[PDB]
Write a protein that binds this DNA or RNA. Sequence first.
RNA 1: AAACUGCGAAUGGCUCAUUAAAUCAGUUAUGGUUCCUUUGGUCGCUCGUACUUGGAUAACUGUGGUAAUUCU
RNA 2: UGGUGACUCUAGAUAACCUCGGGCCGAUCGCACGCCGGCGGCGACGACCCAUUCGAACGUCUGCCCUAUCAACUUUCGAUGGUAGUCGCCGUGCCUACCAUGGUGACCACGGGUGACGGGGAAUCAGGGUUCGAUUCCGGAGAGGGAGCCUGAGAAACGGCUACCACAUCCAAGGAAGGCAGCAGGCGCGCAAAUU
RNA 3: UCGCUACUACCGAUUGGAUGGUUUAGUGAGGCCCUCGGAUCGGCCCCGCCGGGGUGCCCUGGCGGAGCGCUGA
Lengths: 50, 151, 262, 205
Amino acid sequence: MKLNISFPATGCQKLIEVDDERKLRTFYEKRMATEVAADALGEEWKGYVV
Amino acid sequence: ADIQTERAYQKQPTIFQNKKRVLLGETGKEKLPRYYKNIGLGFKTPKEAIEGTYIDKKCPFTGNVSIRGRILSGVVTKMKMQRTIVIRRDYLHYIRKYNRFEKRHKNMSVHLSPCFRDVQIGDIVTVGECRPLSKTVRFNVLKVTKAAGTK
Amino acid sequence: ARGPKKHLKRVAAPKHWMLDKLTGVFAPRPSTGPHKLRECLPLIIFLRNRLKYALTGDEVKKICMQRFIKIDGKVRTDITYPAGFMDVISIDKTGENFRLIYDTKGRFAVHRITPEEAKYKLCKVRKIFVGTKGIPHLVTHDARTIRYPDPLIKVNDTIQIDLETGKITDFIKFDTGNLCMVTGGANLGRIGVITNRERHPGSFDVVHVKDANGNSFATRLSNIFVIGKGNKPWISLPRGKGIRLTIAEERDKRLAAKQSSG
Amino acid sequence: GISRDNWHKRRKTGGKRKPYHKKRKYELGRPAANTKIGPRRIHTVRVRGGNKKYRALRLDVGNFSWGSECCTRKTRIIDVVYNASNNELVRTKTLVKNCIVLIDSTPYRQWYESHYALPLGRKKGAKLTPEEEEILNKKRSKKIQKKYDERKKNAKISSLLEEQFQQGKLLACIASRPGQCGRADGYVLEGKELEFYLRKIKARK
RNA sequence: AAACUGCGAAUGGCUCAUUAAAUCAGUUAUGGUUCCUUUGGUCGCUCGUACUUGGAUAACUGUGGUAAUUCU
RNA sequence: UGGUGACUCUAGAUAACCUCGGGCCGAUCGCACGCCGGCGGCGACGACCCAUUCGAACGUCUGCCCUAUCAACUUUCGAUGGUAGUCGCCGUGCCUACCAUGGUGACCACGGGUGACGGGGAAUCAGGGUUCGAUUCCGGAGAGGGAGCCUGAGAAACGGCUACCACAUCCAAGGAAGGCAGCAGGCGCGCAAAUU
RNA sequence: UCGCUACUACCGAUUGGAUGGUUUAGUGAGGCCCUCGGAUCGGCCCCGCCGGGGUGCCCUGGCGGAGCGCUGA
């Protein structure tokens, strides 16, 4: 399950290929437009909320 | 009331009946002013429409209908259904191979106004064309002439 | 059909256009305008077919888009514009003025007029009513709405219109003894004096008209256009002067011409 | 859908026709707007030629005329009573044209009292209010009181009208089609028409 | 160029299955209806930031999904 | 005020109303440049309304082939009419509620058949007549069969959409896309009809 | 009359089959209308960081948070 990630305050974008099950658990059972603190996505996502 | 035999109050829309004038007007007489028009192609309005009290909106002289189109004539055949009659028109159709004619007829339903009273089924009626008044009615009686056995 | 039509077949076109069978399948369908489809002459059939200033329909467009043709004082770049009875066509480049007047055979004539005569036209009266705040309004056969007219002008009259301003300068009433032209029916193009008018209420009236040679005919009241007061027309007349010749008289008048030649 | 064609019926003689074309769009019908009583709700409908109609679904107020006095005012419609077309339209409280409804009377009671300077609709219990007495018994000049006094001679109302003014509600007939123009206007019943309508209301009970 | 906006696409072309006072033809009426467009009239008639108002979204740039579409 | 053969017409007066799913009363564009900071000339695009043009839609009178081994038909489920309303662009059983019992027929109703689209027209012909008219002009109808809609001034549109019925196309089997009675062309059907 | 050859029309147990059209009752896709519903997207409020002007107050600009606030789509 690949992730399209965009940062609107700068304009940079890339697609990240993720083949893990723990990272997708937080996103499961959620709706669109729900700002959620995705901290399990990686080490740099500690303070990032998407 | 004879004039008020239906579920809705019957009146001539052009006429206003509630002019509060004076107590004397109440004391004097209660007779409504009546709306009558001159349906005019040389025809005359019968005096039973200017002096009558019936309320019918498909009458030509005291109703909301206009007479335009064709003026025809016929013989009254049946007076059975409410306020409309059936008349007969007889004509000859020409067949040209034999150079001869044949009798044909048409049955036409017309509206009869209460201003035309004392009319029996033998007599000549003139009819004028108007707008569709029902499914099979487009003409209206404009003059009544008594039959051969005239009294 | 699910809507209005936009084509006209050549055999279905008005016969007085004088269109031949083998030029095409189609004919110019007149644009919507002041005159009816069956009682008008489009600008293409006048510039190309009558005056022969153009050889094809593409050349009519090249004349029109140069803004050379004025119909009653206004430039029209539409090549199927419905010009009609009593209209004035002005070509300033060649200094020509024409008036659309029927000839005795029922067809529009090439009737050239002077620059002074091109400053006015005669219009029949179709409707008179009163509009908001009590202002009288006219409607003519040219689809002209003229407000504040004289109260003596009634329906079936004729008015004179100055094409620069569009205002009434004079008028002629409808009465016996007045000159008129027939603009429809079987007497189309004929000129004569009104003698009688028989009234049929609930139906069409009938007007009797007598020629200058003593021939009498009748028309429906809607087909009568009052031209002048008495015997004197208010506009210039075509060559035939409105008199319908019989076929024998026409034959003799044609045969006499070729004997004169020599 | 709902069509208003003439070729689905029988001939005059009673014979069955066979249609030659299918349903067109110039023949369509639409569901009825059964205008009820409530705060205003109106939906616009696009109709032939590109025009619009106003389907009123709920109505609360309307323009109604006291014809004898020539006094037309806005008034809150209250209740639905006898209907000349269907007596089922009264149980569901449906507004249509030529329907008998109840309306408030206070806009009419104010004009009558401010014009004739007489108390109408006051019960026999001596109900006096300083605003009302300033409306009624304010002192005018000689000419103004003369013009008011020459007017009281014909300031008389019928006995059936004045009874209704005791209960604060009048009986009115809606003369407008609320499901086509979106509004319920009409006239207050009087005279022999009111006499006729007061009989058939009692004859339903 | 592209794209937004407007207009047209209800005309034309084909065929004759249905259809027996139905269609259609001559004659009449709309005083019982609607009408894009053309032409003319009307467009200070109302007694109650203006020397210019607000938020977006295409084309474009960039990241993509599906075996597949004038998909998105 | 004005007009019709005839208005419940047009114009006028008065009391109010005026829909937020809302009514008009110009925050638009080009070209020439000027007269005494103001004034401006030609156009283009838009605007409620009125009239006009192109129509369309409903009605009026007369007219059509064979058939009685079809003589009575319509009315429960609107058939004829009345009253009030709903719906509709509007006139109307168009539809509803309450009433009345009507309406058509040997002068052929009702039913059935038609190798029946209707006219303008074509062949034959002493005079009368008989037969043909799918076919390029006018009107109607349809887009495989029914039905329903959106947009728009206008469509129940099919070189638009949505379902169902019958056929049929690609597929990684998850899905997606269909409508030549338009011009060519192919198959089929036939005695029977042309160039992708 | 009886005997021999061929072909048509008819009757006929088999409650014949094929094709198509009508209807009773029930179910009933899809659009349209009405009554609800409310994933989301703003604005006006309330606080916190705070500049300017007018005069502790108001008009403002970047915003962040949060309140079963109101209002609109």
